[PDB]
Every structure is written in C-alpha cells, then in structure tokens.
Scaffold this active site. Structure first.
Site, PDB file in Angstrom:
ATOM      1  N   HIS A   1      -7.981  -1.666   0.973  1.00  0.00           N
ATOM      2  CA  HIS A   1      -7.127  -2.218   2.023  1.00  0.00           C
ATOM      3  C   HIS A   1      -7.895  -2.435   3.321  1.00  0.00           C
ATOM      4  O   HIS A   1      -7.575  -3.358   4.081  1.00  0.00           O
ATOM      5  CB  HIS A   1      -5.914  -1.311   2.261  1.00  0.00           C
ATOM      6  CG  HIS A   1      -6.244   0.000   2.910  1.00  0.00           C
ATOM      7  ND1 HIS A   1      -6.407   1.167   2.195  1.00  0.00           N
ATOM      8  CD2 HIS A   1      -6.426   0.330   4.211  1.00  0.00           C
ATOM      9  CE1 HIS A   1      -6.677   2.158   3.025  1.00  0.00           C
ATOM     10  NE2 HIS A   1      -6.696   1.676   4.255  1.00  0.00           N
TER      11      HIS A   1
ATOM     12  N   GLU B   1       2.633   3.752  -4.328  1.00  0.00           N
ATOM     13  CA  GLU B   1       2.002   2.463  -4.595  1.00  0.00           C
ATOM     14  C   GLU B   1       2.934   1.547  -5.388  1.00  0.00           C
ATOM     15  O   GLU B   1       3.005   0.344  -5.120  1.00  0.00           O
ATOM     16  CB  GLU B   1       0.667   2.684  -5.311  1.00  0.00           C
ATOM     17  CG  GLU B   1      -0.416   3.208  -4.355  1.00  0.00           C
ATOM     18  CD  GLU B   1      -1.662   3.724  -5.043  1.00  0.00           C
ATOM     19  OE1 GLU B   1      -1.762   3.629  -6.284  1.00  0.00           O
ATOM     20  OE2 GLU B   1      -2.550   4.249  -4.331  1.00  0.00           O
TER      21      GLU B   1
ATOM     22  N   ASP C   1      -4.524  -2.796  -3.420  1.00  0.00           N
ATOM     23  CA  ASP C   1      -5.730  -2.083  -3.807  1.00  0.00           C
ATOM     24  C   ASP C   1      -5.430  -0.901  -4.722  1.00  0.00           C
ATOM     25  O   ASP C   1      -6.268  -0.007  -4.870  1.00  0.00           O
ATOM     26  CB  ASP C   1      -6.508  -1.636  -2.567  1.00  0.00           C
ATOM     27  CG  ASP C   1      -5.759  -0.617  -1.727  1.00  0.00           C
ATOM     28  OD1 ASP C   1      -4.612  -0.260  -2.063  1.00  0.00           O
ATOM     29  OD2 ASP C   1      -6.330  -0.168  -0.713  1.00  0.00           O
TER      30      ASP C   1
ATOM     31  N   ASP D   1      -1.232  -0.042   5.043  1.00  0.00           N
ATOM     32  CA  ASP D   1      -1.650   1.364   5.073  1.00  0.00           C
ATOM     33  C   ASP D   1      -1.101   2.075   6.299  1.00  0.00           C
ATOM     34  O   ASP D   1      -0.683   3.238   6.218  1.00  0.00           O
ATOM     35  CB  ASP D   1      -3.175   1.483   5.053  1.00  0.00           C
ATOM     36  CG  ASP D   1      -3.654   2.931   5.164  1.00  0.00           C
ATOM     37  OD1 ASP D   1      -3.474   3.700   4.198  1.00  0.00           O
ATOM     38  OD2 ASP D   1      -4.200   3.309   6.222  1.00  0.00           O
TER      39      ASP D   1
ATOM     40  N   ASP E   1       0.849  -1.183   0.000  1.00  0.00           N
ATOM     41  CA  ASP E   1       0.000   0.000   0.000  1.00  0.00           C
ATOM     42  C   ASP E   1       0.888   1.237   0.000  1.00  0.00           C
ATOM     43  O   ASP E   1       2.010   1.206   0.511  1.00  0.00           O
ATOM     44  CB  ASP E   1      -0.931   0.026   1.212  1.00  0.00           C
ATOM     45  CG  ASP E   1      -2.056   1.018   1.047  1.00  0.00           C
ATOM     46  OD1 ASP E   1      -2.451   1.273  -0.109  1.00  0.00           O
ATOM     47  OD2 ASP E   1      -2.526   1.568   2.055  1.00  0.00           O
ATOM     48  N   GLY E   2       0.372   2.323  -0.575  1.00  0.00           N
ATOM     49  CA  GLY E   2       1.080   3.588  -0.578  1.00  0.00           C
ATOM     50  C   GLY E   2       0.199   4.677  -0.007  1.00  0.00           C
ATOM     51  O   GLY E   2      -1.028   4.544  -0.019  1.00  0.00           O
TER      52      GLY E   2
HETATM   53 ZN    ZN Z   1      -4.875   1.110   0.497  1.00  0.00          ZN
END
Ligand code: ZN
EC number: 3.1.26.4
Length: 155
Positions: free
Chosen positions: A124, A48, A70, A134, A10-11
C-alpha cells in the site's frame, strides 16, 4: 457498456487477534467515497476481506471494478480456494467448515455482481489511495466500535 469504478482496500489489526479496522475507497468519475469501521477483536485477514466486501456492496448496479489491494490473503483465497470451495461446498479436505467462511461467502456474493479486474498492488505504501486506506484502517483500529461477531475466537 458497464460503468467503471476503482476500489482500493486495506485492513489493519493491532494483534492476532486484536482490535482492527478496514478502510476502502470507491472512486467513480473522479469522485470518491470512503468506508471504514473498527472492531474490538478481529484479525488482519478478516479486515482485509471486510474492506473489499463493504466497497463492493455499495455498488447498486453491475460494474467493471478495478480492485486494488495488497492483501496476499485475499489473493490466495481468490486463486487457490474460491473455486474449489464452490465445488467442495465450502469445506476443507476433511469435510470441515473453512476458516472465515462467513466473510468469504459474503465476498463471493458481492464479487459475482461485477466484472472484476484485480490489481494486486505489491504494497500500500506509495499508491496514494492505498496509503489513505491504511490510514483509515489504522484509525478505525484505534477507535473500535463494533464486535466482530463472525470471528471464531482461536485463543
Ligand atoms: Zn496495506
């Protein structure tokens, strides 16, 4: 047979651009390793990509990777762009260098190492490892320690 690993990514970014971070978790035989770093000025999309890059680069042998993210941006790059980019020479329709080519090329070099099974998670929130990613990304975004020297500043 290939070892099977699970990667969650995740970013996060506080602006567009703004301080941001990535978070990734690599899980093998139930054991986990976390990855994260924060940048003073970057974008959500570049973070991401970085989360996927860093976890994949940690692998020192060919694996099967269940890669859960995601990121709608990563998916669109994988489905719409990456093939024609390796055919157009990483150029746009007007013969211009594509956006984030530095990270897309780095990802492609790590992706081609493995048998990738994408898990396009809708969001997420819920899937525990994606939630923790996250949290790691937001944590890095609020403690940025590196410059994203590959970000071509658009403002
Ligand atoms: Zn996310």
């Amino acid at each position: 047979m290939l070892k099977q690993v699970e990667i969650f990514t995740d970013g996060s970014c506080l602006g567009n651009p703004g301080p941001g971070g990535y978070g990734a978790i690599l899980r093998y035989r139930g054991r986990e390793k976390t990855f994260s770093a924060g940048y003073t000025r970057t974008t959500n999309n570049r973070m991401e990509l970085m989360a996927a890059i860093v976890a994949l680069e940690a692998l020192k042998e060919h694996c099967e990777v269940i890669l859960s993210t995601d990121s709608q941006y990563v998916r669109q790059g994988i489905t719409q762009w990456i093939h024609n980019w390796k055919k157009r020479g990483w150029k746009t329709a007007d013969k211009k260098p594509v956006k984030n080519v530095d990270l897309w090329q780095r990802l492609d070099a790590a992706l081609g190492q493995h048998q990738i099974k994408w898990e396009w998670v809708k969001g997420h929130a819920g899937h525990p490892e994606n939630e923790r990613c996250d949290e790691l990304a937001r944590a890095a975004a609020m403690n940025p320690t590196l410059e994203d020297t590959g970000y071509q500043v658009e403002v």
